[PDB]
């Protein structure tokens, strides 16, 4: 096994994260969501930045999805404030601000993410399956 | 906006008052009207609630400005900012940004630069 | 309210100015309710669940 | 002349409508006054404000925009049928007949895997 | 709060009185160690029963790890030489068949004195043990206030 | 015939759609819909769900798959989850990452967990589930539950004395011992003796801090009956009984 | 089976004129007619039944009997749906329809029976409010308006009482005294 850094994770292929009991898993999902929104990592980064309607988060419990949506919304607002102020009180947010060279475009992307957080693609397992069945109903053959 | 050739056509149009018969410009600063609109065609609205909530209003005022023989008269009663709801309506109507982000340390340390809210104000 | 698209409609793929959408309609209804309030505005929501006292988050507009 | 009156609240627009009515009066006594509304409740509120302003709110029609558009279609263009041939249920009953005729076509090959597998005319409807 | 309902929560002081209680699975429904697919054995073969009991013991160890890692300040455990077998004194106890005794007795069958020495072996500043004393003095004090 | 659907029926219909030949193109439509996936709680994964996630995001470029989970928390085997699906997923993928720091508990509890579960090798008895010693938080290094005298340790294994005991007698004796410890903590908390201390900050132990972790409903009722005898009210958060049966 | 009798009954109703000069319904063009006119009448004073019924009985001759109705003080709006308003030779007229008529089968629906039906069903207040609404509408719409010059009367049509040989049976023409309308407008205004 290897240690996991939230700002050095390669977002290519399949990765298996083993979050132990009591660890900040809900914080790590929000950090990876901000990494996917801003497109950070350098060589281990995503090829292109994605929007809120292209990031898929799958969690079984519905209250867990609501809590994760609220926490990701709060992380988006806090990173937008820290990017507009160029300072923060958190070390992971400090490294996130140090990784980016531009400040205005990232703040505009975080503002668009805060405005499009209502249309976030954070559903459950059965909810995502029902949405994929109702979306492409011709290839699946459903009512 | 659509084109810079459409921006001058919009700048030539003005709104005269219905009762007072005085013409008023469409923008706050006509010289900086090109700096407000981006190259893609989207205006950076200072009010964040109007920018995030009124996209249907954006499309409707765009299609109303797209009309040729339209006659636009403005009758706007100004709201005196005394309450919190009146402060919000004045910030929406006057098209200004009162959300203090605190870009520097002087804006972040001092806190009396915002608007005072009375504790007996039960508006919102 | 977020309304799921039909999946094979051409208006959802290419949006125009005069296109009906439930999300933008509700976000403009909230703005019209904020503007239409003259004296007092009373916004109430479910912040805590009655079953297990779990924290419930409000809307993005609020 | 098309006139659009920008205002913040609806009371100023109601006062402007009152000024337009008191300024220019209708020549015909039985001519209706078309006031387009968003719903029935806004029409009732406009009737309440016109009764509170004028003292009488009578012979004022409040049509919906599609109803007013169809009324202008009837009044301006003659020899128009009262019900359209392109109704929603009418187009559904026509497409129930036209879609099995077009299953042999090459462009409908996405639907041939959707319809010809098992159908008691439920997926077709 | 049950163990499945305590996943993802947080509690300062946690008491686990029946963490040594275990149950033996009788039905033969297991998973293959090579193909990783569910195999249901309708016949009462002892190999499928043992391979299902191994998965049951792994599930009990996962339940023990879930229940232990929810305390913040203090957790208390109830350990006892529980014998699932109907024999009263056969010279051996079934704590090695449980999830708690598999970490204490290191997966080895022992006795009550062996279990006590295995408990007293791993004694640190954080891990301590005491005997279970049955006794009551007074229920509680209300300490009411004026209204 | 009725045109109805169920919760597992959505998984079954999606697996039957992706099992076909044209539905693979539908998976490409999913690759046109979301070219990324972050899947939380991967221990509670049905084999149909992992077959779907392998049908969509196995080895296609530009799309990322992030399976965030924990094999030590798979306790929903009665519901339909399976740890062997997680072991197959661990055998299929190549990279593995783990979190080092623990931010919830005191370092004494973290050291007790790392001491109890690392006695032997592969304490979870499966070869594909390894255990590693986690690290405690630096900001929560001063968490102490103090009694009237010395500092109380993290884990206190109350050993019931005797050679061999049954089930019901052991349950009754440990419930009485737990109720005695709860009433002692509540009696010492209201006088300023038992406290929770973070550095120099102190907090008295109320009734909402102590929680009993049981596994069944009968032993939960036993704990509630043994706790209501000592004038201590208790609630059952896991009570799923209907109000119409009372 | 009712249809060939229904069409000849409809043509017999339409052939019978209902006016003091003998004006039929076929002489009304599409611009002259106004069918189902809805009005909202405002009132700011508390509508007292005792102060209103005496003012009604002062001028209405049909209020000789008919003990007064009881209703609470209504401040706000009054809704109304007039059946037909039509103009003819420079004079406006109101027309309403009543069609229940369960208790009559012979030719006994004379003016006395129709007046007894008006007193029993209390249709005097409805036609008085209709005259007030039409007077206010013609005062607001038409400048330099006179109530005696423009208004002509109110016609009630009983559908089951119209006979081919009896032109008076079925129709009921009543005109106000032109003094109750101004006092009712002053009461409803404030």
Curated annotation (Swiss-Prot), chain A:
Disruption phenotype: Decreased degradation of DNA with free ends that is unable to undergo homologous recombination, which can fortuitously lead to more efficient viral infection. Cells are deficient in DNA recombination repair and have increased sensitivity to UV light. The cultures have many inviable cells. Cells cannot be transformed with retron Ec48-containing plasmids.
Signal peptide (residue range): none
Coiled coil regions in record: none
Binding site for ATP: 19-26
Disulphide bridges: none
Origin superkingdom: Bacteria
Functional summary from the UniProt entry: A helicase/nuclease that prepares dsDNA breaks (DSB) for recombinational DNA repair. Binds to DSBs and unwinds DNA via a rapid (>1 kb/second) and highly processive (>30 kb) ATP-dependent bidirectional helicase. Unwinds dsDNA until it encounters a Chi (crossover hotspot instigator, 5'-GCTGGTGG-3') sequence from the 3' direction. Cuts ssDNA a few nucleotides 3' to Chi site, by nicking one strand or switching the strand degraded (depending on the reaction conditions). The properties and activities of the enzyme are changed at Chi.
Family: Belongs to the helicase family. UvrD subfamily.
Free-text note on domains in this protein's UniProt record: The N-terminal DNA-binding domain (residues 1-929) is a ssDNA-dependent ATPase and has ATP-dependent 3'-5' helicase function; both are stimulated in the presence of RecC, suggesting this domain interacts with RecC. Holoenzyme reconstituted with this RecB N-terminal fragment has no nuclease activity. The C-terminal domain (residues 928-1180) has weak ssDNA endonuclease activity as an isolated fragment. RecD probably interacts with this domain. The C-terminal domain interacts with RecA, facilitating its loading onto ssDNA. Interaction is decreased by ATP. The holoenzyme may undergo conformational shifts upon DNA binding: the nuclease domain of RecB may swing away from the DNA exit tunnel in RecC. When Chi DNA binds to the RecC tunnel, the nuclease domain may then swing back to its original position (that seen in crystal structures), allowing it to nick the DNA 3' of the Chi site and then rotate to load RecA. At high Mg(2+) the nuclease domain may swing back more frequently, explaining differences seen in assays performed at high Mg(2+).
Something else known: In the RecBCD complex, RecB has a slow 3'-5' helicase, an exonuclease activity and loads RecA onto ssDNA, RecD has a fast 5'-3' helicase activity while RecC stimulates the ATPase and processivity of the RecB helicase and contributes to recognition of the Chi site.
Subunit structure: Heterotrimer of RecB, RecC and RecD. All subunits contribute to DNA-binding. The C-terminus interacts with RecA. Interacts with YgbT (Cas1).
UniProt name for this protein: RecBCD enzyme subunit RecB
Organism of derivation: Escherichia coli (strain K12)
Gene: recB
Full-protein interval shown: 5 to 147 of 1180
UniProtKB/Swiss-Prot annotation, chain B:
Description of the deletion phenotype: Decreased degradation of DNA with free ends that is unable to undergo homologous recombination, which can fortuitously lead to more efficient viral infection. Cells are deficient in DNA recombination repair and have increased sensitivity to UV light. The cultures have many inviable cells. Cells can be transformed with retron Ec48-containing plasmids.
Coiled-coil residue windows: none
Family: Belongs to the RecC family.
Summary of the function given for this chain in its UniProt record: A helicase/nuclease that prepares dsDNA breaks (DSB) for recombinational DNA repair. Binds to DSBs and unwinds DNA via a rapid (>1 kb/second) and highly processive (>30 kb) ATP-dependent bidirectional helicase. Unwinds dsDNA until it encounters a Chi (crossover hotspot instigator, 5'-GCTGGTGG-3') sequence from the 3' direction. Cuts ssDNA a few nucleotides 3' to Chi site, by nicking one strand or switching the strand degraded (depending on the reaction conditions). The properties and activities of the enzyme are changed at Chi.
Misc note: In the RecBCD complex, RecB has a slow 3'-5' helicase, an exonuclease activity and loads RecA onto ssDNA, RecD has a fast 5'-3' helicase activity while RecC stimulates the ATPase and processivity of the RecB helicase and contributes to recognition of the Chi site.
This protein's domain notes: The holoenzyme may undergo conformational shifts upon DNA binding: the nuclease domain of RecB may swing away from the DNA exit tunnel in RecC. When Chi DNA binds to the RecC tunnel, the nuclease domain may then swing back to its original position (that seen in crystal structures), allowing it to nick the DNA 3' of the Chi site and then rotate to load RecA. At high Mg(2+) the nuclease domain may swing back more frequently, explaining differences seen in assays performed at high Mg(2+).
UniProt protein name: RecBCD enzyme subunit RecC
Origin species: Escherichia coli (strain K12)
Covered residues, full protein: 251 to 374 of 1122
